[model samples]
Target chain A: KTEQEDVLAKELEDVNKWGLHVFRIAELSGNRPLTVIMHTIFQERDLLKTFKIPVDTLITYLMTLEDHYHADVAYHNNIHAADVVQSTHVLLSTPALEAVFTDLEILAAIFASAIHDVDHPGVSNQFLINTNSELALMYNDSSVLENHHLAVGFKLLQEENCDIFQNLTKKQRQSLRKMVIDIVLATDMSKHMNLLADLKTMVETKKVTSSGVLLLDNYSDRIQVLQNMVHCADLSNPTKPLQLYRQWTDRIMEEFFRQGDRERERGMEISPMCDKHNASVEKSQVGFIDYIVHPLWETWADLVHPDAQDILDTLEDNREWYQSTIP
Target chain B: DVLAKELEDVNKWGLHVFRIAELSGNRPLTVIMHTIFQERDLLKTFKIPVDTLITYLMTLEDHYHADVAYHNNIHAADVVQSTHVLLSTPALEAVFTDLEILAAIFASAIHDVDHPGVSNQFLINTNSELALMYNDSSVLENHHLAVGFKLLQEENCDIFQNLTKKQRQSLRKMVIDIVLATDMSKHMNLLADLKTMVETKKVTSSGVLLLDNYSDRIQVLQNMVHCADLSNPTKPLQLYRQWTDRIMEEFFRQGDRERERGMEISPMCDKHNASVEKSQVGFIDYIVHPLWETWADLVHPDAQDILDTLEDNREWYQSTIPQA
Candidate 1:
């Protein structure tokens, strides 16, 4: 019911960033330049180089992902791309991660974010598994959406000019590949319980060296950081300044409610996030933070320190907004 | 003699054919004998079904075939075997009686005799053919139970050959409750209730449950079979690994076909083939472990072995390499 004019703007990129309007020449090419603003917050020279790949190539490949299949209601559309990229930038600024993450790792995290929601068909993984869809077949029903996102993301890189990944040594590329894939695929909401469980366990036993740096001796530990990072980013909307968070809430709820409309059309049972009329968009963010986001960010905030403090402040502000909106 | 022969045949073939005489014809005979004896002893204590039980087992088998895996005859046989072991526990000895054991085995054997090779959630999601047949009321479980009992209608298969009307009616209801609850969808409710019960820490003087009556027994048994069906994640690491390989293979094959037909694949069946071990570890730690831990708490000493098995199973996934 909230109108664009009624909404406050803070961290938002402007409603103009939320559409296909700019892509008049081609829908795919429209959002390519947005990546510039997305990465503007990062200063690492080497990390910035990763995104220097010809903008046209990245857009073209993403267009393939978008055009590969028809999406219903389109929650995983261009807006989601911008949202994730913006989130990656915010997450990178978290103190713990900002200082320790090498330029390559930061780039991988950002890249993973941009591509995480690519090709999403707007249905829950449960729907796909229940319906026995094609993706479920290819991935053998294991994290179908998550796996598809990773594959499509990497597959885009294989194209000649889009090889934004070309600079890394094979070993570094492989490391980036592992971290990116795990973090992106774990984005599926059905995996939510497990993701949080892992995070909570990591928090309880959180290990670090004498200087207080996060230990990343092996693949699991390193990937765990990325997994928790993106998960935090995906749910990071609530932690943004209240005005910005409200805009994100509006867009995501619209996306979810639209999916609900499609479900009604198909006569499928509407899931929690998809139920449009019943959900308290304001109240739900509280639950989303308390249940999903807070736990993730608390652990991550501990890991990253002062860098994440601002994001955590935004989270508190967003939660208060919901609290005030209700009753 | 029948179980001995089936065992011999199974050993001779070095195979579990899923369906064949070993499963259909012979395993049921032993299951019936064991279930009837357990029920008779317990019934004597309760002044109930000392005779009607054996006939039910025989009748149940008359409806069974050999080819199904997991829910095939051997699985029924294994559950009955496991039921016996659980019943023998010092904590459970008196309460389980023969009726509970009979219900447990009967439910497990018929659990998926005619299973449609997809989960209940899957049935409802795809607007599946089964969902339509049952009006969406636990369609898969309903059909499984209905088919299990319907088989007993055949004169030759009526293993409960001697049950009086009252005895038959009670057995039927008890068995139905136990089997239908095996659907994984009921797991959360079942475990939630179990955890609540354990937290209250109530036990009678015998170190057995005072609250543990027919409703309690059936509730626990329901969880037992559901756990057994999903026990692949908690078995010895090797066994757990093997079952995951098979189930994932089955799921992927289903996924591949769905792809061919332009359908969505099941979530866990995604066969993108990159990080199976890492993926499984996440699943086991999150979905599988918590459920099993709760179940293990309910049965205490009885579930200790299964708890160990589950831990071992999770450990296996933690270290496994991608199948590809």
Candidate 2:
């Protein structure tokens, strides 16, 4: 485990770049991608010493939280959570964005991303709502999975050795919980159009301070941007290298097809992109880009010009590869 | 009967050849004849018996081997219909005479008659019968022309009989130039000529194009058919996807044969290895876009819609391939 940790330490040394292969890091960390990424991100930010978090508590929390993710699921596993963390790392590192967020906001952003989808049921919120699952009833059919993730993530922190936030003041802990919940609930796809609209509005009526820092002072403005940041990270797979992108696509599609298979067994209509027989990989991607990914990224790129250009280029290239394979 | 009805509007945009093929009893010749003789009023101008003309076109369409995947009569009719669309461009409408229009349409319909599923390089590499008979130079294209002219030589099939010696000579030269230019080897010269024409474009006083020379006129016609030939990715998404599937299937089949013969499968022909999206971007970027962009410039606002659709299709593909 020590040797594997060393490998992860090395792999994560330059983890700010968008190309950090979380899958490889997960393997190197002996299947603890989430723990390795979370620990490294906190240490890199010097949050442990600055916030007086007990180092052992952080480690225990992350490890125990990792156990909550079902490895059998094709997607929505620890790897995806870790990938989202890395993506948040990359997004927050945007030079234009870096100066705007304070240390606390940064910590909250990373925490929300790390646990946004913790213990996901390898299904969607709509699936929960449609099936009248317990989580759905508990959350009243609104962001059911998201509310559940928040609940489980906070529950894990109740353990003695897993409460990294124990050292923080009540005010700080309350603010942190509020921020985390706001970001996690915003992860619902239902919020996407509104989130994107808000992002575009921010970009249009952007403010800057004298020192060249973006003026995201208000909670609504700041959380809105952070929500979009975590959302971008969740949808960052297509912007990755072809090899990694294909691997992610395979996992997500497998997960989707299984959902489709279950729906078939229950005599429910198959989901649009989940039906394995009718759903083509290339066509699904094309539709995904046109409807969801492109519009979101186009605005995100506008917010961080020249910085997000390469990611957009990667996205266009991926779209090309998918379109060419449409036959 | 359904096909004949569809053929009534074949000259319009968004013509679905697959639907037409199905209703035409899978005989694209019937659709082509209806489009040319009835739609274009070529029957009265050529002084031909409608039944005899249909019979001749049916025979000519039948010469297109159904086994070849991409180069069958369906493709031929597609090219013919696309050529009609290009020729109908507002700027180009007055430039081409009926004789030129007939040649362009006729050449497009018979451009790849008797085409083998294999490419020219395949024919040359395998030292096949086509390569030997044509001396390894534009073999497939030359065969298409020969087969087409032979069919025209039959009784009552001489659509060009009403024309004078000079008219016949001019039409023959235009048809030959147009058919031979479909060879892949001629692409560079063809595109180069098109680029130059667009660069040195000349318009009449009323904003129409002025083609003062045969070279300038022929260059546009050559590119018109070329555009139609490679217009698969430029089509509306639903139709474009259909064409893409057929072409890829054809390429994969060719790849399978190459493997059986222990020959190197051409790039993009290998079924398992080929990327449908990457190839589309490359094809559009390097081939289709450049040609259409220049052609759009040549025809100006007349082709603006087509150019816009081409960009839309290219971007659609552009957004699909995985990047760095």
Candidate 3:
């Protein structure tokens, strides 16, 4: 009775906090973090009202997408999907990016983040390729999972009960679909080097507006920012508060260890980050932050200026903590 | 000793590579590519060293999957010959620049380097490493181009080492366009673009097409490579028959591999229920003839001889198959 009463207080009343702990919402929201967070964000941003999306259709669409997140996966589940959505909204709201994106761009950022990892098999793209998984075949091993997520998400939207974008004109729909696909595909790890290289180039060639905001006078810069924003949100666990960050680290490591076990059982070479018995969690996190995470945020933090400093600081602190714990 | 006579007609459209394959000391592609470059005087004009050209061609031939029935160095040799003959079409004489001609010949010579004897779909479906590396789109073509350019990274094999910055950039762009256009997935777009060109083709007083823009010029060059790629069917019957056996054997090899994996067989690849003669007839009537029809119009009477041979070869195979 006490828990039921607290649930009535905390069940569905959250919106727009950068530090909103989605993992806590796992239990408080009846394990429906994605559906609840999505509905609240749509209303919080007034996207539903602006886009004329019917509430019922949006709810129906969210529920269907939430169900597709495999219940068996440890790390890439509905909670992670919702966490990315909140993180994306916070990244887009940086003071340096004020009024930089149009409303349609905002809608796509929110939409792409919410559905980015739906139907993830809790495995890497290389694993899919090595095992001859049907998805690797279907997408030709190029961004296999990213392509799958976009295709499945779009197919769900096509259903009559889940057509949230039906009120928009055909041109609006086409542009939105293109943005979502580009944003989602940018999350492929194999594309990390190229994506980071392009981002570095853009920062060096960046222009500005009178208000001191980033000036994107062309479609290329506009889309590049959006792509980088969603990508940042996807890689954002290290930037979260320590408690929340540690939980994410634990969940993802478990996922990697499980994949390692499967590879060993099948007599295949284990992936570099897998192999639980020989793994160095502290060292891995230090290297991960040093090599992959810090370089990206350093460039991103430079682009967004003072607005991204707090997030950048937290990432550094986390890296330090992990390094100190290493032998 | 017999190599010179075997390669004498190497520059001809109908020159067979079967004899050269035997007489060239297992370096038919090297022999043919060297002959074409020498006859065109490309080494002197481009300042490419003779030794560099031979070393590059030899390295490229060795990398080609010698076991594959089609899409090996021998097929590569055939395309270079076909591309050479088509470029020399009387109506197109003096149309392309020396740079453009060099790029065209280079494109054909390296277009199918290191073929894996399978369709892009097969590699993609099987999750082959090449498919993953290229992200599944144009898997084989991308690999061919990647390997081709990489061989040039060797100092002694640098064919364009002396080219100026902009000139080298221009050559690379044209080569990529022509090589990528060889992928059958682009077949419809390549043909449709050609048809559109023929409908509103601009010409000068001497009847050579007036292609002042890069888009128009590249489209014509792209079609020439594409046309020559499918020209195996339009060759003399004996040549056509030999290529058919090899390509079909390649297809069945893929089919056999698929059967072992229990995959539903790909088109034209099943060995047991193969209908080689009828399939070739349909290929001409449908895929081959429609493309050459627009091609013939673009170059007018120059392609008439090739089109006539395509039709004649179709009847020869059509007669062999029992009509219902």
How many clashing residue pairs appear in each of the predictions shown? 49, 16, 0
Off by over 4 Å in 3: A1-327
Instruction: Give the better candidate number (1 or 2) by TM-score.
Output: 2
The CAPRI-style docking tier of model 3 reads incorrect
**Model 1 segments more than 4 A misplaced:** A1-29, A33-44, A47-74, A166-169, A201-215, B1-11, B15-324
Ranking by lDDT: 3, 2, 1
Better of 2 and 3 by TM-score: 3
Q: All candidates' lDDT scores?
A: 0.61, 0.83, 0.84
DockQ of 1: 0.03
Docking class of 2: incorrect
> For every model shown, what is its TM-score relative to the native structure?
0.48, 0.50, 0.58
lDDT per residue (tens digit) for residues B1-324 in model 3: 678987788667788787788888778889988888888888899899999999999998888888999888888888888898888887788889878998898889889988889999999777576654454567777667667777886769998999987787788778878888888899998898899999999877788777888999899999999888889889998999999999999999999999999999998899999899988998898889999889999988888989999999998899977778
Worst lDDT run of 10 residues, candidate 2 chain A, spans A1-10
TM-scores of chain A in all candidate models: 0.77, 0.96, 0.95
TM-score ranking from best candidate downward = 3, 2, 1
Retained true contacts (fraction), each candidate: 0.00, 0.00, 0.00
